[PDB]
Amino acid sequence: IREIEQERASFAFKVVSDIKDKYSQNKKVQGKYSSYAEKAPTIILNNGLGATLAFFLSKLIDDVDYKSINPESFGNAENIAYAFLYKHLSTWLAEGNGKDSAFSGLTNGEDPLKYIMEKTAIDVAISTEEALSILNWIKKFAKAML
Amino acid sequence: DIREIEQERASFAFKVVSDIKDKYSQNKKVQGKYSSYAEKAPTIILNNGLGATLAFFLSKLEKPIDDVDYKSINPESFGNAENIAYAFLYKHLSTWLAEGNGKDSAFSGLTNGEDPLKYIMEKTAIDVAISTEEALSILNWIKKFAKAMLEE
Amino acid sequence: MIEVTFTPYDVLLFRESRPFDAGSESVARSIIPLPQTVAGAIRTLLFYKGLKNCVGVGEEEPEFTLVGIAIGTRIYPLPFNIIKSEKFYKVVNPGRFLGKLILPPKGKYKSGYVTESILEKYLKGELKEVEENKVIRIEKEKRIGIKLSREKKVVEEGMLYTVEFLRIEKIYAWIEDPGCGIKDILSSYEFLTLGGESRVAFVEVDDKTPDIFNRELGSTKKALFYFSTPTIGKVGEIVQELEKRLNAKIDDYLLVSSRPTAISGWDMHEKKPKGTKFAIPPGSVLFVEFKEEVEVPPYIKLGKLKKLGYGLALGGIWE
Amino acid sequence: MFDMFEKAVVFGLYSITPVHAGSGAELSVIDLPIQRERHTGFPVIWGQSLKGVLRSRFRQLELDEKIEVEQKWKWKEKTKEVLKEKADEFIKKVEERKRDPLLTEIVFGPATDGASEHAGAVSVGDAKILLFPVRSAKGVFAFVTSPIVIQRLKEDFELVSEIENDIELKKVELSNNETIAGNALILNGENKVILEDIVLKVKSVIENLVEVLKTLFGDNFFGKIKERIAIVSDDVFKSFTRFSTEIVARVRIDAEKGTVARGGLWYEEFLPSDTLMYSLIAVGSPKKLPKEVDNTQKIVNVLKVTFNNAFLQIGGDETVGKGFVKVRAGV
Amino acid sequence: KAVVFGLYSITPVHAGSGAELSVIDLPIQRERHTGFPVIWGQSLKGVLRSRFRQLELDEKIEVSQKWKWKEKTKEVLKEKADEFIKKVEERKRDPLLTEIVFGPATDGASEHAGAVSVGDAKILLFPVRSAKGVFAFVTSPIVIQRLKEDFELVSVELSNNETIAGNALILNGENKVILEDIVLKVKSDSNVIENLVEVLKTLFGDNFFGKPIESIKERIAIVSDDVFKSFTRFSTEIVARVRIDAEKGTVARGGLWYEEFLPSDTLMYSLIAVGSPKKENLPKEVDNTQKIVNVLKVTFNNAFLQIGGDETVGKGFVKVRA
Ligand SMILES: [Mg+2]
């Protein structure tokens, strides 16, 4: 339960750094990502993980595939920040830090939203807790870097 | 290891919305109408009731609101985009209340296969209340996937 | 030779010589086990088994001979001519000045333990240094206890105490039995009390001579003697004893050592402390240049109280 | 074989308002979670939380001479009867809140100043969940429990049995999609129950459990249930206790601007009302003594009379109407 | 001879260690070398001695007759019996059998030693929250190896991502176990869990402290040494406690601290090494090791004890199998 925290922190630092790198001169994008990262756990708490992912989906389709998302191809800061947070959260649940690391995800590459629709209630609960935990780490680095 | 109804709701909602997008990929009107009607439906239910909502859809198809089984309704047999969409929405909603997401799923409906509107006009107020809440819950998920997938 | 293996159930206390009475001086710090403590544990078992002939009740020594002891995880204290330099412990060989063997200045000694294999290479003169990670320290475990009132469940006045235990995996003891039947009696026991605070160690016994006692070092003038257990007696008498037992005179010798080992103990027969004796500490090395070539023995017993496990020296060579 | 105690009393606790037995702030979406047993995830109230509540109430009652022993308990008089000479100085300590009144210190132990004098006579056990309220499609809500909870209740009865030396005082298996439930919860013509977001199949135990509840808390249930009792599997029950608690957003409003102030938005968890918990209260021989309370039985009697049918407040947020429970103390 | 004491916690346990290095104000006792939770031999012995002493004074000790310690004291110490009994009432000494078994009270320490050596209670099964089956009884290869060594003398390979677990912990078809918030993949294994249960049955009997040992088998999870150590160090209860200034109704000055607890549903074992009773002129029914062992078993088997601190706030209660 300690090594998993380090893995989360490593991922969180990486994705926030990518945000700050690509949009260094764009404070609006950085600020939007930060706000959404803070609001995200709340949306999950009050609506569940499934609905939250669906809510992100509406901010972007043919199929539910986080891989196919391209955050940089959007017009405004709101959609760019949403697409990034959505992909980050989905990537973590599906891939972790890669298959060369301790944590390689929970869903084995499957999109978390479709995963929720197919697997058991237990599978959904662990995905919910894990989602809250990674967002909690993203919030830390967001406040300190963005 | 059991599943929660929410999982079945999301699953069913994705399936019926994908079914429309598949059968009418070139028809943005049908997709746009369905999304509008899915969005409108919960508000009608809260103000006028579930029974009046199901009957409201059937009246759009000019079907006798008293002598129609949901299974007999085939959305792919209508001309205008409006009636196609209404038929789909009525079908999807009724199927959910009648059969859920399947007999071996974590939710197999509330009306035990009986037509929901006939069920409403035959059962007690408490039965209708339970079905009404469930109708709102499945429509919430239909709206979610319609908003993201269906185009205008 | 019989090999006894003690496996501590949990912790061990080999208390230093200092007052440790409830309601007064209340701190017990463990030292590295002295061989007489191990001898005492064995003698006490025989004392209770009814073999009071081999015990030596009220005597300094028993009838049998404890060859020596060693702790294990088998490890030995760093020879005192091994000096830490950065991240390495370097072996420092004897020099000569004014016709006298000396140890050249190369830094201060730092305490620690090495495996039996590292010691073997040292004794063969093939060891140059040891990486600091291969130098072991003995783990201590500090416990703080109290005494409660019988009824009120609160601490009685002044009844708090501290013990610094050792966390040791194994203690090995080697015994030469002149026919007392120690191997059979030890086999009948699963455990025994060893050291203080009524701690016990499991007992295994095997009829075997450890390989380190069977080494062939060859013949040379330049022998060294690593003391694996404390050695009691004047250096002059020990060197003279060495000359007699190997039938060879010595041109010069150098004792590389440290703080003398203070040895007293508790006399269970008379129920009072034993008299204080002073010993050459384990890890000390006696470098010897014999007048003629000698066959360096794998081990040799020197000094006083041999039967209590003292004076176990391991043979070696230097250049 | 539990000879350190001589008698025991079960403290039944029924919440009539939401309860926040807190564990402190966390860096999490739920800023202020309730107390939980970590390896089961079950909500608890630690014995030290409950003891502090019981002590404070008992103390105030003794200071106001409302304590009944055998007539009224005059602690100053009994103090003079026990401490004799140095009784006056002790009473002065109490009025200065340095020490606590005699019976209070006998039962719960001395105030922090006299901690080293003697230990408390009673052991206040952690409160554990017995019935947890869960919304139901039919019957509004259900009193939900599980085999592992029923088992822990039986084991606690074994504790009481060992303590009171009463051997006379001393099987539920369910699939995850199954339940044993009262008639009020069962959907019309389906043989199914819907609790929260889970459909459960009705299985053909409750009557016996109620009889047990009738033993500890009397013929009446806290002045009020079998029709809404639902027994579910251990893991389903566990998920309910962890995800069906009240989670509430609270704010601090700037009194001048009418808007949320900085550092004025947090989420707080509450154990729902209509939750049944219980704590085992073990009583040993007093370690400090007047004849009225010189042994275990007399101390038990005082405890029973003092707290049975009483109302207590446990946890924080008392000022916003949280933590109010009704107590039943039976042997 | 020796007696193995199995200890099963039914409430959280705080065996206090002042010397333990921790960020917690009041941490529990732990082993130096392994970092595992432990109950010191001296803590356990104190608990055992206090219980035994109370029973002796209350004439509840059985040796198959009622032990009358004052009668036995007179037929043992003879002319010195009356002054000894006086010391016992004066709490300067303990009753006869108590001092035979555990040694004299400190005043009479030098007279003779205690017959028993009370060993540390070592951890065996540590409860960890499981997504399936509520919680798992978790152990490790190093623990099993220690148990086997202690038992054999008194008479497994896992990666950090793997677990050998019983069926009740395993997600259907996924071959996974979820302990708290981490996922371990199930390693196929045939007899290791079964072997462990057999060892437990050989030491404590068919009933596992009030339940069939076969039920426990389905909820045992064997994890790697590093993972087990992690759980025993970071999954113990860390609880904030306060003191309220009732004058103000707020937390008093210096009235906040943190305390660690070993959870309930923890299994530990202590080897009680029994030597010959060392007091002079012993009564016949307790004059050797076997007789001391027998009294120990009857007195503590199926007993309930309180270990550690926080007794009055309901902590430290364990079931005993001897
Ligand atoms: Mg001692």
From Swiss-Prot, chain B:
Subcellular location: Cytoplasm
Source organism of this protein record: Archaeoglobus fulgidus (strain ATCC 49558 / DSM 4304 / JCM 9628 / NBRC 100126 / VC-16)
GO biological process: defense response to virus
Keywords from the UniProt entry: Antiviral defense, Cytoplasm
A single Gene Ontology CC term: cytoplasm
Highest taxon listed in the record's lineage: Archaea
CDD domains in the cross-refs: Cmr5_III-B
Name the UniProt record assigns to this protein: CRISPR system Cmr subunit Cmr5
Role summary: CRISPR (clustered regularly interspaced short palindromic repeat), is an adaptive immune system that provides protection against mobile genetic elements (viruses, transposable elements and conjugative plasmids). CRISPR clusters contain sequences complementary to antecedent mobile elements and target invading nucleic acids. CRISPR clusters are transcribed and processed into CRISPR RNA (crRNA). Part of the Cmr ribonucleoprotein complex.
Gene3D superfamilies: AF1862-like domain
Membership in a protein family: Belongs to the CRISPR system Cmr5 family.
Swiss-Prot record, chain C:
Single GO cellular component term: cytoplasm
UniProt entry tagged with the keyword Ligase: no
Gene3D superfamilies to which the protein is assigned, alphabetical: 2.60.40.4350, 3.30.70.2940
InterPro entries linked: CRISPR-assoc_protein_Cmr3 (IPR019117), CRISPR-Cmr3_IIIB (IPR010165)
BP terms from Gene Ontology: defense response to virus
Keyword presence, Transcription regulation: no
Assembly description: Part of the type III-B Cmr ribonucleoprotein (RNP) complex, an elongated RNP with Cmr2 and Cmr3 as the base, with Cmr4 and Cmr5 forming a helical core along the mature crRNA (39 or 45 nt in length), while the complex is capped by Cmr6 and Cmr1. The 5' end of the crRNA is bound to Cmr2 and Cmr3, while Cmr6 and a Cmr1 subunit (Cmr1-1 or Cmr1-2) cap the 3' end of the crRNA.
NCBIfam families: cas_cmr3 (TIGR01888)
Family note: Belongs to the CRISPR system Cmr3 family.
Protein name: CRISPR system Cmr subunit Cmr3
Organism: Pyrococcus furiosus (strain ATCC 43587 / DSM 3638 / JCM 8422 / Vc1)
